[PDB]
Amino acid sequence: SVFSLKIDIADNKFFNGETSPLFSQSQAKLARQFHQKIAGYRPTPLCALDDLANLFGVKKILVKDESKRFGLNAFKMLGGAYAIAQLLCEKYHLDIETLSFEHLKNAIGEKMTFATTTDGNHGRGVAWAAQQLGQNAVIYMPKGSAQERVDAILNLGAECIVTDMNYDDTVRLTMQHAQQHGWEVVQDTAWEGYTKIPTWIMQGYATLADEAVEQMREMGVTPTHVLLQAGVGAMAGGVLGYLVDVYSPQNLHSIIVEPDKADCIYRSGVKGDIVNVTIMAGLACGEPNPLGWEILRNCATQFISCQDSVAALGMRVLGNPYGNDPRIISGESGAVGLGVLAAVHYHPQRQSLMEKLALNKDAVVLVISTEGDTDVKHYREVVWEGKHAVAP
Amino acid sequence: SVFSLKIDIADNKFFNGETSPLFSQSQAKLARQFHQKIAGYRPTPLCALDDLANLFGVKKILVKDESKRFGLNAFKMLGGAYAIAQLLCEKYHLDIETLSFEHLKNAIGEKMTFATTTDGNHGRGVAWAAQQLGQNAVIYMPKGSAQERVDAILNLGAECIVTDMNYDDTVRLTMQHAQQHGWEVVQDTAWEGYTKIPTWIMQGYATLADEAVEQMREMGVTPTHVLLQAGVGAMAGGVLGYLVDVYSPQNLHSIIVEPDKADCIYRSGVKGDIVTIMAGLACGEPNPLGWEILRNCATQFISCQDSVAALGMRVLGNPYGNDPRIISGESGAVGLGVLAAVHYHPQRQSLMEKLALNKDAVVLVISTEGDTDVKHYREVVWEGKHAVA
């Protein structure tokens, strides 16, 4: 059926192609060397959706499936565990490059307590790392957070306090308690006086991009496009930072994807300056991450502000593939990049939307599925019950 | 996670447990012998939905996947091709056991013309068999029929006429033209003076039942339940007829499943006498031959809301846990849809008790068709068309 879902596309007028000092091939290779030492490491699958690509009128659609990332069901621990390891190594005067993760688990020293607010995956990665390394974790979640996500954190030995307040008021509470008790704040975003931890996080994320590049080279393919879903822009910034260093920013058509109720990067993209703004878990934004914004402002090709139901489409399209394509389990925020492609294909303005996005029969499109079914109830409501339908 | 879809359950008050020697084991095996000889024959998969069973609170859910029935994407050829072969052997003094497709496809001489009305699957089976055996087919389809289904018939070398009338009015036109030009009417239902062809069709359908029994006995399992979606009850009658001969009609909890606006068998079950719908489950009047079997041997009849089928499609297409994926059309999935609707229903406990569904239940389900209309299929599974709320 032909349907019209809100897709706003805006060219990045502030593009300059200046690559990053903090986020490149070398730091990502370092991070992956670290990840390669953790029990249960395995590069996550890069799935070829050949039949969907032929339906959509592109050459290839490739989906990085991060639901396979160590049983955490999301990509987030790549950064969270890396930042936590770095912090511990720093406190114990250890060199993270010359030791194994197991060496770190049995490390002796003063115990740290990590404090975080999360709407799902970030807190879980922090809680996971804290437990592995014998440290403590205190994770706060906003009002209305799903009990399953709370329990995922509790099952990792961390305290998990569900507040009566929204996301931002909970961050403030995390910061205030951490000051009071002498805890270490671990957030995936940056602000003035707080750039060190978010940098490690973004460098850690780049492991998934290094894996994808290797896998693409093995396949003998070169991407022309990448879609990156962005909350504050930590993943987008870190992942694009890596890919832009490999491919050049002129020769990679990067698209940043946000839901329209939290399109903080999209709005910043039009103005050029930082624009400050419930949202699908994962893609919340209040203020854009300033470290990530630097990379996106410089190197992102386009920004998209899309309708919420676009993500739900993506969940379904991945969950019940076309032709003989492989099946992928993708949560709301995980699927929105793929959703964009599905939404463009059924759109009346298919032809001009494709031309705008420079999609054609030669396009090799890289998509990141950032999480699996982290809320199983919401997942099945979408894919089985048809909740958040296209028309409704 | 909580939703109430209408699923009317009625015990069969007219149950007597009288099997049908006519639709039993021996006739199914005879029809299977015929299908076995057809190039590319392979029994259709019987998929174990173990993780779905554990979620729903039953021992096993087994799904007969008729989307693998040759390249037809539906079970229907099993009856249609068998009946057509029997007609040809009768007319041209041939032996069914030694019948050569290659010989009939190329032979010169007298040819039959087979006339039928379909909403999709039946006519495609008739067209397929006509092509394979060197005969002619003229297929009529009602107003609004999907162009993909029309093309599928045309691709088989048949004539396909799309009318501006409903299903029933198209059947009469088929009968009028066949009488006028001397064609052979091949319909998958019965009326007075028209039972012989439908009989073969129902016996042919039982090949899927014979296959599933073989597969279940290879698995070492015994089914406690079977859900059968019924249009006029030809598939149901033929399949249950077979199944109750194998397992006895007392030891097998059979549930006949019908959509809302076409519940002709359900209304006949409550009364006791013969009384544009999702493709394949149109009725109007029940098949008398099928009705005799269901009245006798069916444990229960279900009249369910339309969206139950759309649920089944999505549940099959995007499985739970590590279960195998199954592509199932609207009518194909409605049997599985009932199970998923019960599970999420407020009255789950009293629905399962009413259906004798428990932790020991081994539930056999038939997926009668795959994605025969791909536009519709993807609208349901991707776009969320016919949502639960």
Side-chain angles (χ1 to χ4, degrees), chain A residues 1-12 14-28 30-53 55-58 60-87 89-101 103-109 111-142 144-171 173-178 180-217 219-249 251-260 262-270 272-286 288-392, chain B residues 2-5 7-12 14-17 19-32 34-36 38-41 43-58 61-96 98-101 103-104 106-158 160-171 173-217 219-260 262-269 272-274 277-284 286-291 293-348 350-352 354-358 360-389:
Chain A
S1 134
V2 177
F3 56 84
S4 301
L5 296 180
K6 175 178 175 185
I7 294 167
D8 291 354
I9 309 162
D11 299 312
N12 177 20
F14 300 89
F15 178 96
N16 59 19
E18 174 179 295
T19 60
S20 177
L22 296 140
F23 311 111
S24 71
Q25 273 174 108
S26 58
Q27 298 84 358
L30 282 170
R32 188 170 174 195
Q33 277 182 276
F34 168 79
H35 296 125
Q36 284 172 326
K37 296 174 173 173
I38 303 158
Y41 174 82
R42 169 89 68 90
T44 58
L46 187 68
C47 317
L49 308 180
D50 291 349
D51 289 335
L52 193 73
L55 181 69
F56 290 178
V58 296
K60 299 286 276 181
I61 298 171
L62 309 177
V63 179
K64 188 69 175 152
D65 187 6
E66 288 296 308
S67 90
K68 289 333 205 281
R69 179 73 59 195
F70 299 88
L72 270 295
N73 213 9
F75 78 98
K76 283 273 210 280
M77 60 82 68
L78 289 167
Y82 197 47
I84 283 183
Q86 287 279 185
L87 263 43
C89 286
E90 194 169 66
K91 187 192 186 59
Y92 296 175
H93 306 282
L94 298 172
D95 188 356
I96 195 167
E97 306 177 27
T98 63
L99 54 78
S100 67
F101 197 77
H103 286 146
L104 255 195
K105 306 218 295 160
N106 305 308
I108 222 78
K111 280 182 190 169
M112 307 184 67
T113 309
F114 303 107
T116 308
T117 41
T118 191
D119 61 354
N121 303 315
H122 175 64
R124 195 177 161 172
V126 161
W128 179 94
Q131 177 181 57
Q132 292 291 127
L133 302 181
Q135 314 299 310
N136 302 112
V138 179
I139 278 87
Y140 295 70
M141 296 188 75
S145 294
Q147 187 62 44
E148 190 184 1
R149 292 189 165 111
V150 177
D151 288 350
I153 288 156
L154 292 170
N155 274 153
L156 290 167
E159 285 154 53
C160 188
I161 303 145
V162 183
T163 59
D164 296 307
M165 302 166 299
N166 68 136
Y167 188 82
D168 290 345
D169 294 43
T170 316
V171 179
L173 192 69
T174 295
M175 272 164 76
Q176 181 180 293
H177 278 313
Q180 277 173 39
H181 294 101
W183 300 337
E184 196 75 30
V185 175
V186 179
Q187 290 297 143
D188 56 330
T189 187
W191 55 96
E192 282 175 51
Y194 193 87
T195 57
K196 192 189 191 83
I197 301 165
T199 295
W200 280 327
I201 287 170
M202 294 170 58
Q203 295 175 347
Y205 290 164
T207 292
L208 76 89
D210 186 85
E211 290 180 0
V213 159
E214 174 181 4
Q215 289 163 311
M216 277 186 302
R217 275 166 187 167
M219 283 174 75
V221 302
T222 310
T224 58
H225 291 75
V226 70
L227 275 85
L228 299 170
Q229 58 270 68
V232 297
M235 191 271 281
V239 165
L240 187 61
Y242 178 87
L243 295 161
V244 140
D245 199 73
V246 180
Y247 294 111
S248 87
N251 293 25
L252 182 70
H253 188 124
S254 60
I255 299 151
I256 312 306
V257 178
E258 293 184 298
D260 60 340
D263 45 22
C264 68
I265 287 168
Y266 179 90
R267 288 180 179 194
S268 300
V270 180
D273 289 286
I274 295 148
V275 176
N276 184 275
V277 169
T278 54
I279 320 304
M280 54 181 83
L283 295 178
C285 187
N289 185 329
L291 294 174
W293 173 236
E294 187 61 31
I295 280 80
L296 302 183
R297 187 201 151 96
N298 285 358
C299 299
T301 316
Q302 293 170 326
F303 310 103
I304 289 177
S305 167
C306 64
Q307 203 178 319
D308 291 350
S309 67
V310 169
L313 180 59
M315 289 170 73
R316 294 189 207 99
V317 176
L318 285 165
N320 186 347
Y322 201 75
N324 298 123
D325 286 347
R327 182 163 162 264
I328 303 162
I329 311 309
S330 194
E332 196 170 22
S333 294
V336 78
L338 195 283
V340 162
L341 293 186
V344 168
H345 173 258
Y346 290 107
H347 207 282
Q349 294 182 113
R350 192 185 183 271
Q351 206 185 116
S352 52
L353 289 172
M354 277 176 89
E355 197 194 343
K356 183 71 173 174
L357 297 169
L359 291 175
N360 61 28
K361 70 194 170 187
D362 296 316
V364 175
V365 184
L366 178 50
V367 175
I368 314 297
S369 185
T370 51
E371 65 165 9
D373 52 343
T374 48
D375 181 356
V376 301
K377 182 211 262 264
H378 177 76
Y379 186 76
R380 294 301 166 176
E381 280 176 331
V382 162
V383 306
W384 287 356
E385 296 175 36
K387 187 221 216 168
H388 297 193
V390 156
Chain B
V2 169
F3 61 90
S4 311
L5 302 174
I7 64 169
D8 293 316
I9 302 165
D11 295 317
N12 183 9
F14 307 92
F15 182 96
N16 60 25
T19 64
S20 175
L22 178 64
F23 300 110
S24 55
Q25 264 170 302
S26 73
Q27 295 89 356
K29 281 173 155 61
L30 278 180
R32 189 161 172 191
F34 162 84
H35 301 116
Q36 268 177 177
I38 303 176
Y41 171 85
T44 57
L46 188 59
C47 312
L49 301 181
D50 295 342
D51 293 342
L52 198 70
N54 188 274
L55 179 72
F56 288 5
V58 291
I61 296 164
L62 306 166
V63 186
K64 194 61 166 149
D65 186 7
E66 289 298 311
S67 74
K68 312 297 199 198
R69 188 57 72 187
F70 296 86
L72 277 299
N73 208 17
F75 80 94
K76 230 75 154 173
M77 62 86 65
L78 287 176
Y82 185 52
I84 283 170
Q86 297 274 18
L87 282 162
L88 285 165
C89 294
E90 195 175 51
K91 210 194 217 301
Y92 301 156
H93 313 255
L94 309 161
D95 197 310
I96 193 85
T98 59
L99 182 74
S100 171
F101 280 48
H103 170 241
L104 265 69
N106 289 310
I108 61 166
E110 304 186 308
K111 275 169 184 47
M112 293 186 83
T113 307
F114 305 104
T116 184
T117 289
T118 193
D119 60 10
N121 297 325
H122 171 68
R124 190 173 160 175
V126 166
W128 179 94
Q131 176 178 73
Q132 289 291 319
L133 301 170
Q135 309 304 296
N136 304 134
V138 183
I139 286 91
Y140 292 80
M141 295 201 71
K143 179 179 189 283
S145 292
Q147 186 58 36
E148 185 186 353
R149 286 168 171 140
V150 178
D151 287 3
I153 282 147
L154 295 173
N155 182 59
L156 294 168
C160 187
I161 291 88
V162 190
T163 72
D164 71 354
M165 297 178 304
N166 66 15
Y167 183 85
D168 283 51
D169 289 353
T170 302
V171 174
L173 188 75
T174 296
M175 290 163 66
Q176 193 195 11
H177 289 167
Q179 182 56 43
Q180 186 182 165
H181 302 117
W183 302 333
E184 193 78 27
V185 180
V186 185
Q187 288 303 131
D188 50 347
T189 190
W191 54 95
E192 277 190 34
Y194 191 83
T195 60
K196 188 228 273 286
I197 291 162
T199 298
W200 285 327
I201 289 171
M202 285 169 70
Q203 289 171 343
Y205 290 167
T207 293
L208 76 83
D210 187 67
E211 286 181 2
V213 164
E214 186 184 319
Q215 286 157 316
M216 282 187 299
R217 281 168 172 172
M219 282 181 77
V221 296
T222 304
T224 62
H225 294 65
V226 68
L227 280 87
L228 297 168
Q229 59 269 70
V232 297
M235 187 276 278
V239 168
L240 190 59
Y242 179 90
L243 283 176
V244 300
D245 189 50
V246 170
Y247 297 112
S248 98
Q250 296 84 4
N251 289 156
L252 187 275
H253 198 119
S254 52
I255 300 156
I256 312 300
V257 175
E258 277 181 313
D260 204 35
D263 58 345
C264 67
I265 288 142
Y266 176 93
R267 282 185 288 101
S268 292
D273 320 318
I274 298 205
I277 296 132
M278 62 178 63
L281 294 173
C283 184
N287 173 12
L289 287 51
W291 171 242
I293 295 141
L294 308 181
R295 199 205 198 263
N296 288 6
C297 293
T299 323
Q300 295 174 307
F301 308 108
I302 283 184
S303 184
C304 73
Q305 184 185 350
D306 255 354
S307 55
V308 168
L311 177 58
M313 289 168 76
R314 295 183 202 108
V315 173
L316 283 165
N318 194 338
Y320 198 76
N322 295 135
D323 283 352
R325 182 166 160 250
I326 302 168
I327 315 302
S328 190
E330 202 183 359
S331 289
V334 72
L336 187 279
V338 157
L339 294 179
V342 167
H343 180 259
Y344 283 110
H345 198 90
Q347 272 70 71
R348 183 182 164 278
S350 65
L351 288 174
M352 277 173 87
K354 182 70 178 174
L355 296 163
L357 292 177
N358 62 46
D360 304 62
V362 178
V363 187
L364 171 65
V365 175
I366 317 298
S367 181
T368 45
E369 76 174 349
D371 52 347
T372 42
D373 179 346
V374 302
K375 186 181 174 293
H376 180 66
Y377 182 83
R378 295 301 163 176
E379 283 165 349
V380 172
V381 305
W382 290 353
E383 301 177 21
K385 161 174 142 187
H386 301 138
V388 155

